[PDB]
């Protein structure tokens, strides 16, 4: 029954959600009994360069509160050489973990967590940052809400959701490439596994999502909107793929019943 100090207040550990090689994620309560997620980051064995890495993030995170609540949030933390602790907004389960545990999902539901995935993506791009690495663990699900926890600036893991332009890169990256990501997650919430899962060779995946040939299938569905969406966001021109501000006033955000 442990217990830990952030910037004076004291929080008493309940259990750990997260491990990372040098991090991780606490289930903690306050003097007054409410609920937050500490992480912990351990710094005794780190570079510059991903030091100055962790610094921007929390600046960034920090910045970025205001601006939405679709963004998670950062009440407080503590900074060492040693160590950095991260008071937290608290979440019931990551996307990720709720996709895999959730066969049927909700056209309602799906609809509501994609604006909010667009909302949290938008405000980031605003500012200049691109995250390049979207996938559903990015996102935590809160009071029913999906909330944004990373913006990729800071450090198995899957290429099911990289755009062809990083690949064929081999900057090159622009807000498109979180579309294509985010895109991916739809498919997935749509049709149940990710535009190239059923491809095994990694290789032969990577030559599949940057291959012009290769159909990507598009199952007919009662959601004639959710269809287009899907079919501009993974549209391997970046120039051609539909942009965020578009996807906010597309008909299947904007309508209501379809
Ligand atoms: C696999 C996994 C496990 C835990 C989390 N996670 N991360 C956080 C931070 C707010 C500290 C970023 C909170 C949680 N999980 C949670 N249930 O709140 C996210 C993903």
Same mark, same amino acid.
């Given at each position: ?20 090689? +040098?991090?991780?994620v606490?289930?903690?309560l306050?003097? *007054?009994? =409410?609920?937050?997620?500490? #992480?912990?980051?351990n $710094? ?8 100055? +890495?962790?610094?921007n ?5 920090? *910045?970025? =509160?205001?601006?939405?609540? #679709?963004?998670?949030? $950062?009440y ?25 545990k ?23 791009h605003?500012?200049?940052i ?5 996938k ?5 699900i809160?009071?029913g809400?999906?909330?944004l926890i ?6 198995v893991?899957?290429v099911?959701?990289?755009?062809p ?7 090159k ?6 579309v ?15 535009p ?5 060779n ?9 291959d012009?040939?290769?159909?990507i ?22 120039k ?6 578009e ?12």
């Amino acid at each position: 029954f442990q217990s830990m100090s952030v910037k004076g207040r004291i929080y008493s550990i309940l259990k750990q959600i997260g491990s990372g090689g +040098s991090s991780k994620v606490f289930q903690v309560l306050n003097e *007054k009994k =409410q609920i937050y997620a500490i #992480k912990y980051v351990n $710094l005794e064995e780190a570079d510059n360069q991903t030091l100055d +890495s962790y610094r921007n993030e929390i600046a960034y995170l920090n *910045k970025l =509160q205001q601006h939405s609540d #679709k963004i998670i949030r $950062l009440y407080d933390y503590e900074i060492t050489d040693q160590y950095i602790y991260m008071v937290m907004e608290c979440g019931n389960i990551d996307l990720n973990s709720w996709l895999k545990k959730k066969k049927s999902i909700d056209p309602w539901e799906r609809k509501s967590y994609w604006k909010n995935m667009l909302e949290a993506v938008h405000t980031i791009h605003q500012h200049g940052i691109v995250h390049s690495d979207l996938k559903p663990a990015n996102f935590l699900i809160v009071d029913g809400m999906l909330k944004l926890i990373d913006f990729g600036i800071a450090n198995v893991g899957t290429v099911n959701y990289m755009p062809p332009e990083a690949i064929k890169d081999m900057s090159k990256i622009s807000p498109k490439s979180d579309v294509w990501s985010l895109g991916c997650i739809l498919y997935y919430m749509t049709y149940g596994k990710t535009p190239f899962q059923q491809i095994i060779n990694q290789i032969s995946k990577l030559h599949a999502i940057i291959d012009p040939n290769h159909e990507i299938e598009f199952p007919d569905i009662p959601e004639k909107d959710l269809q287009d969406v899907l079919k501009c966001c993974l549209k391997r021109d970046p120039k051609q793929r539909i942009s965020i501000p578009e996807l906010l006033a597309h008909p299947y955000v904007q309508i209501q019943t379809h």
